[PDB]
Write a protein that binds this ligand. Sequence first.
Ligand SMILES: CCCCCCCCCCCCCCCCCC(=O)OC[C@H](COP(=O)([O-])OCC[N+](C)(C)C)OC(=O)CCCCCCCCCCCCCCCCC
Ligand SMILES: CCCCCCCCCCCCCCCCCC(=O)OC[C@H](COP(=O)([O-])OCC[N+](C)(C)C)OC(=O)CCCCCCCCCCCCCCCCC
Ligand SMILES: *C(=O)CCCCCCCCCCCCC
Lengths: 50, 79, 330, 155, 128, 171, 177, 87, 99, 65, 122, 459
Amino acid sequence: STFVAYLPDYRMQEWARREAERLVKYREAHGLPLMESNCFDPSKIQLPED
Amino acid sequence: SKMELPDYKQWKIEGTPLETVQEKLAARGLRDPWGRNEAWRYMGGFANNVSFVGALLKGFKWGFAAFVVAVGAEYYLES
Amino acid sequence: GKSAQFGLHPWLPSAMEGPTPVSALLHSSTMVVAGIFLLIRFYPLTENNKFGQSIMLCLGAMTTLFTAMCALTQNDIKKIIAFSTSSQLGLMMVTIGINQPHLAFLHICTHAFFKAMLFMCSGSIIHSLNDEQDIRKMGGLFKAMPFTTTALIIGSLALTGMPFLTGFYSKDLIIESANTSYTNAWALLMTLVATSFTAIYSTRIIFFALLGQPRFPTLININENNPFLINSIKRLLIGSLFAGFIISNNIPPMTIPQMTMPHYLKMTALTVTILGFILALEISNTTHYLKFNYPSNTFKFSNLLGYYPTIMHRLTPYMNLTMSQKSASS
Amino acid sequence: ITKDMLPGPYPKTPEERAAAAKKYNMRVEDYEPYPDDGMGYGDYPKLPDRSQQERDPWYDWDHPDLRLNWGEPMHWDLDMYIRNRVDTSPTPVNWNLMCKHLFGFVAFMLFMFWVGETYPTYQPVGPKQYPYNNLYLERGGDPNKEPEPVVHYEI
Amino acid sequence: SFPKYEPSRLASLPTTLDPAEYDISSETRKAQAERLAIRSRLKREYQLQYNDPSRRGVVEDPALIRWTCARSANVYPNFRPNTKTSLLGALFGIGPLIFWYYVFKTDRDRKEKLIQEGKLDRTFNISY
Amino acid sequence: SWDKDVYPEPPRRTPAPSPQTSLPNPITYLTKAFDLLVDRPVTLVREFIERQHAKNKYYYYHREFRRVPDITECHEKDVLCMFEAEMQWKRDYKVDQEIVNIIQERLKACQQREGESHRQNCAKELQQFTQVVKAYQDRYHDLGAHYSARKCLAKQKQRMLAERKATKEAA
Amino acid sequence: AFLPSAAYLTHQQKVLQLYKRALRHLESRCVHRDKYRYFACLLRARFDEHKNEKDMVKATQLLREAEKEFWHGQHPQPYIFPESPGGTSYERYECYKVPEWCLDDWHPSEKAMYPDYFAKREQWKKLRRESWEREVKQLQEETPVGGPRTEALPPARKQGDLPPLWWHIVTRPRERP
Amino acid sequence: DAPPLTLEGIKDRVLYVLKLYDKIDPEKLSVNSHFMKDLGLDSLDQVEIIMAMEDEFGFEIPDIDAEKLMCPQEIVDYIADKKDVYE
Amino acid sequence: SGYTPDEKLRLQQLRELRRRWLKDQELSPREPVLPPRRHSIFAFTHVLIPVWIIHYYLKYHVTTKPYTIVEKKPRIFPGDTILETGEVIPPMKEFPDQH
Amino acid sequence: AHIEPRYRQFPQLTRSQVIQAEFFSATMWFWILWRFWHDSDAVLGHFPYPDPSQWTDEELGIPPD
Amino acid sequence: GAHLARRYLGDASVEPEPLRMPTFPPDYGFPERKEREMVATQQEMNDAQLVLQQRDYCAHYLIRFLKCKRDSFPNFLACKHEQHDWDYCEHLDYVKRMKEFERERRLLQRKKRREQREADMA
Amino acid sequence: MLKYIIPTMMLMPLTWLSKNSMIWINTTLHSLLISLTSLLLLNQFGDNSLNFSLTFFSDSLSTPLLILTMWLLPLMLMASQHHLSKENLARKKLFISMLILLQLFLIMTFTATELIFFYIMFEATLVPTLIIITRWGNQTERLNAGLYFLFYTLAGSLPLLVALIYIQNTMGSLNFLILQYWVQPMPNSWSNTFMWLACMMAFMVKMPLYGLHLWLPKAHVEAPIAGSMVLAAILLKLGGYGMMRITLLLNPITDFMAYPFIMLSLWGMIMTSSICLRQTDLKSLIAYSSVSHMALVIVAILIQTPWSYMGATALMIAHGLTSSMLFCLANSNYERVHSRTMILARGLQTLLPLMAAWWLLASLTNLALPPSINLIGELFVVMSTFSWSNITIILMGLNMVITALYSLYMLITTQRGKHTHHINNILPSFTRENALMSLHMLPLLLLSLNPKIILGPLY
Ligand SMILES: CCCCCCCCCCCCCCCCCC(=O)OC[C@H](COP(=O)([O-])OCC[N+](C)(C)C)OC(=O)CCCCCCCCCCCCCCCCC
Ligand SMILES: CCCCCCCCCCCCCCCCCC(=O)OC[C@H](COP(=O)([O-])OCC[N+](C)(C)C)OC(=O)CCCCCCCCCCCCCCCCC
Ligand SMILES: *C(=O)CCCCCCCCCCCCC
């Protein structure tokens, strides 16, 4: 119980807060949207022909 | 352990509604052999029970006296 | 499921098999209101919706009418007050079903007090008669237990909704909001009939348990001088006398009060209570005659719990177990 | 326990029927089995299908909580027929009459509830009046869109 | 005159209203006497095996193990597949499966055809 | 402490306590009793622990990952670089999940702190939450329990063809 | 019909049981003492008016009509005594009826807490275990062939000899432990 | 609650109930006085006595044991056994 | 009916044995042999230590985390004065009185 | 002390329970009477109810036709 | 309360539906009709944290009652006059509501007399 | 994974070289040392699994199962050390060696990176359980229990192995660190249908699926309780590991094919809950409850949503612990009364209070009392199945009634009521028994505080 109580940051979950705590702090100061509908860059994809 | 039991001649069925019950069986020619068994419930302090309205207004005298005393006290207080 | 309404009601009268304080807490004052507490918890969602409000109002009226009808002619005292608190739960879902949250919450706060105090007074009477819980063997206890006599009279008066008591500050507001609103007329009618039936069974408890000639056996072990019981009944009597007034004063105004109505829609609660008192007084006076009245279908339908623990507690387990064994296990 | 203590197949002739009856230690004529319809019942005795509340409660039973003695050929559904389960007590009212009364009562007042839903009660009043276009901004509406100005008139 | 209380599956006749108590044929008392003899033998055996100071263990009732063996282990060896058993097995084995399959199927096509055309409101549904 | 931009809170406006009647209230006396009996030893043991903290003050650092080429520039069936692309994609997945979590925290805090008139003063938080929910639903929803960067890229491709078809059919 | 000793209920016993059940239901019907006494005297007078009837078949048919009206006119919830089956306190105190052989399982460090009781228990057990062979000798010669015909236990026929099969009927604890 | 009762207490109670019965004369009764032999009552009077004792002690006696105890001493013995006197 | 002498004698002996056992159920005065081994202690241990512990926890571990103890802002009425700013909310217009 | 049970007679009554019961009944009735004299509103009425039939037409602004 | 029998057992045309009323023009027979007045400005009405159900047209008595309750602690019974004033205002609003109901009923009944006159001569 | 396999293979001579009276103490002590050592597997990252070597890896999924396995071995050793006191010393060492070999094959099963290795040791596990079931049982039907247990499972997997070999000829590697990136979609055809059936049916039998569940009650009412606990608690989880390692390759054909499997699992879990409502043996009742729980797990992994995977893993671990401790309860009762009848021994709360408390805790944790991990997993699966379709909640709702109704009833007739008069050998609580029961119960409560360690590979 003492080992699993002080286990060093399981799956970096707390780290998942901290960088996120940085990231919005970036994009709320420069007018950028919070998250975008495109997961990757939409200009770096060769769209197939239709 | 040992309790004293009351006299079994002091339990009389007279003055009770069981006397009227025995009157009814005497009118129809029957006997009530178990009136003396239930005779004790209809005398003494166990008898003379107040009615429903008498149950609701229990202690109304003291309450109304205190109410009129308090309303007189407030009547003098506002002056 | 939690407040024991229609469809899932009979566990509330069935749960009187436990100890008396267990009933008096859980199935009288505290645990049974959890479903109603969940309903008034989610009032911003039920405020703008009409379907759920209508169906839950009709379910509450159904529950309070059926439970009051079953409570009219029952012979067990604890079962009578269990049906009483189920009817009160139906009334609280009726008044939250008409978009009045804080009135229902105030009724919860008052009902816990007075219903718990009636339950412990009944438990003291039960213990003083050597574990005998039938209303057809008590009575003549006005001068035998004067403290519990006064407490039971005050509690029945508060249950009926008598003026300027703890039940007056919540139930009268509930019924005046139920009268003057866009309600179902059938629900309002069964609310009034439920109020009359509450008056009838409360004065039935008073007449058959506190007045008249004694019916218990001759070994008289009447005793109530223990300081714990006296102090507890005194505490809840002070509560049921003044805490309702204190709570109704100190709650912030969060709803529009309705007080412009005609006289016949304002005297309704007291007049129906007095009418129920008069009708049950007629019944109690006519029970003293040396006659015999053959019971009709009304008494069989009333005293046998609406036949609901006789039909739905016999057919559904039979069907489930025969499906489980004859069709599945074998 | 051996090969003729556990229950066996269906007994056909009177002799094997008597052997099965003395296997369960009961009367020969009162031991009658279920009909061999292919459900795999066997030579188990068929009780008259009554509950266990009907048993004598004052009799000195071998098992008092079950009202069951020792060596009795028990029911095929003893688990179903305990006191804590389905009960077959003789009710003072007729069962069909009970079902008819309950169904009629429930259907009648459900129909009356729906009838009252069709024709409701109300108060002789008008609608409630709210300022600022019936509280357009306080309802959560957007402020960049100007609502239609509706006013409430005195009488 | 008086209501005739009908027999029912959930409401048996009482032990007192049954006319079978009040017949005075001789084989009735003979059967009752032989039942009492059987019960007396069983009760005598139980009391002799149950009041023993030397015995420390469970009184092994043959009826309990007999019933538990007849409940499970003696179903297949005395089973013969006929029209009734096969019909009941097919009715209670593949019926509800087909019913639930068809209900869940048509629910799935309705939900899918609602969600591909955008008619299903999935504004806030991001946990799945 | 915490940064005030990522968790914004309006300044507090507490009205002046001015008695109307002459009856005193016990709240001030109990507040003084709380400040005397409770707050002072708590502050004393807090200054004790922080003074013991001041002797041994070592630092820990927030780990940062450099940007790696994504799944688009990965040769097919060459695991040695799509492994890194998937690694970065999973880290960004966790970051985006926590971003939606912090927006939900903002919305809940606004709705609680705005009292009974929260339906009007939390319009900005509702708009931000709706935008971030639509972004998360476009970015990560319906991937399945066996999600991977290839499936997310295929879903993004299908959404792009749907948008291009909607543009062409309504041009 | 079902009795520990008998196999057939005599018509006199059935009449008495009908009288008992019908009068108990009458008492449960009318609560008050005076009405109960009056109607009980009426029922006793009715049974007395039909008492002088020595015809078996006529009393048979009269019993059948009587049972039919008794079931037709019974209360749905008859009064049941608090210790009777069906009562409110039926087998409630049975959770404390721990049998005596649990005292066999006690630790020796607690068996010295009550030395006199445990010495009395061991001498009682010695008495029982020496009387066991005597009582099974008593049943092994008094029982008829093919087992007993009735369940009525025989008494002890000798002075000093304990009653046969006496233990587990006399061993049941008090109803208020 | 519910004080234990000695054998003489229930004996006083049973003789009191017998003395309060009109059919029993209050002089000829005893513990072993048979109802049909010493006093010559009927079976119905015996069930009346059984009901009186059931209502007096507040518990139910089974019908077989109601008809089996045939003397006041048998009533005393059965009540003392069921209440387990002399604890 | 009555009692056969056999069953009556049997229940007499059984009642004798029962009365004997219930006589021997009484305990002697020396049993049980037990082996050998502040007014304001409740209001200090059960109250004050929980107050100190929960106040330490709430002051230096929960208030440091954002959006944990979120409190509704107090209502603002006309004629009040904010202590942290000093600006006074201006007085509300006179009532068009009717009573 | 503890009350010894009495056989088929009236049980003993301590003066304390009777005094407390009469006290509670007195405070009950006194509170009822005091609240009924002071408030006198929620049991009888708060405001008058104007009838719908006594209104005229110029209050309602109905031209005649 | 005879309107229920006049509507359901009688004729439902006389009693207007409370769900959608009034549907008549508001200037019908009311020249220079003056609307009701709001005393509290919207910001000063909103910063008191007042629930939407109680946002009536004369909530000045209500907000003064809330202020009286908030500054008279612990003497809770010292603000019954403000409660009486708020009750008076709510009562006056209810008089306005049944005046609107009577106006709608009498105007629609005048429409019935009009169509009866159309039946008489037109 | 050599730091746990070598301790097991080195404890093997320790139980072979131990003295004639210190086998149990030494084996229990050293297995508890291995159990403490096994906590080092929790070095988990939010992106990458702890890949130890070429043929061994352990993500967030298999680590709680490994910890459960080598925590389960000492509990089995204590639970099977009573009735083997009269058994010969060589056969005692044979039994302990069989348990040790079963643990070794289980830990090698959950960490096998290659699916062929996973299959090979996943039914190298078949030999020790078969040996224990057939040899150390207590009835005749154990012989039949060696047939239905065996010829079901192998008949599900001898197709499957061929299918696995086919993947070795198709993808070129069956490694799981490779197949997460080389996976191709499965087209709609009859060949892919039969490949899906072959890859599914082995673990469908091993769950078991309803219809194929006949091997579970027949192999539980007669086993030595070490075998009963390993079968109920950890041996049924091989199907779950098969699901969460195989379902990556079987997309997207699983979505429009698993309809009859889900119908069978839901209606069969309803049927088995109903069968629990009318049982007479404790062991059969617990086995049918396990059938219901594994049918729920089948639905959870078949709908394949992340919430369902969290709920499936949590429900798997919680059900394993609960079923093992329920079998410990039933073994204590069968030890004391020498029978398996439920109605025989009643009212044991009057005689055994601490076993009554353990009965109450077992029944409370069985019906998913919050905030236990059983309720966490069951609730997550409930929400995922509501997300699959609406009407499913009805097919859940009745079960959640029935899964309470027997779960108390199985308690009540075994604990509440008038005790049986003719039973007098009810001994008090042995310290070994209650120590085993507490060692079962305390981790189940403790995991409710920190559930994030047992929430699957995608928490
Ligand atoms: C794991 C899979 C296989 C299963 C079997 C495993 C076998 C081996 C078991 C090894 C030992 C156990 C390991 C798991 C231990 C889990 C517990 C644990 O350590 O959690 C860590 C967690 C850690 O907390 P945390 O995660 O919040 O802390 C964050 C970590 N730090 C501190 C570094 C920032 O411990 C707790 O949560 C403890 C909280 C305080 C203690 C409890 C206080 C309240 C107690 C109850 C009061 C009354 C309440 C009301 C009751 C009403 C009636 C019911
Ligand atoms: C528990 C008992 C029941 C177990 C049931 C197990 C599942 C049922 C199906 C199993 C089939 C056997 C394994 C097939 C693996 C195929 C893998 C694959 O890629 O196939 C594609 C290949 C496709 O052929 P191909 O790949 O060679 O062709 C090249 C590709 N095309 C088609 C484009 C040209 O499928 C087959 O070759 C046939 C597959 C079906 C096999 C049918 C025969 C077996 C039937 C089931 C018997 C089950 C045991 C019964 C007895 C049990 C004991 C009593
Ligand atoms: C006109 O009378 C309408 C009154 C409101 C609707 C009917 C309410 C009926 C029930 C309450 C009043 C009962 C009076 C005896």
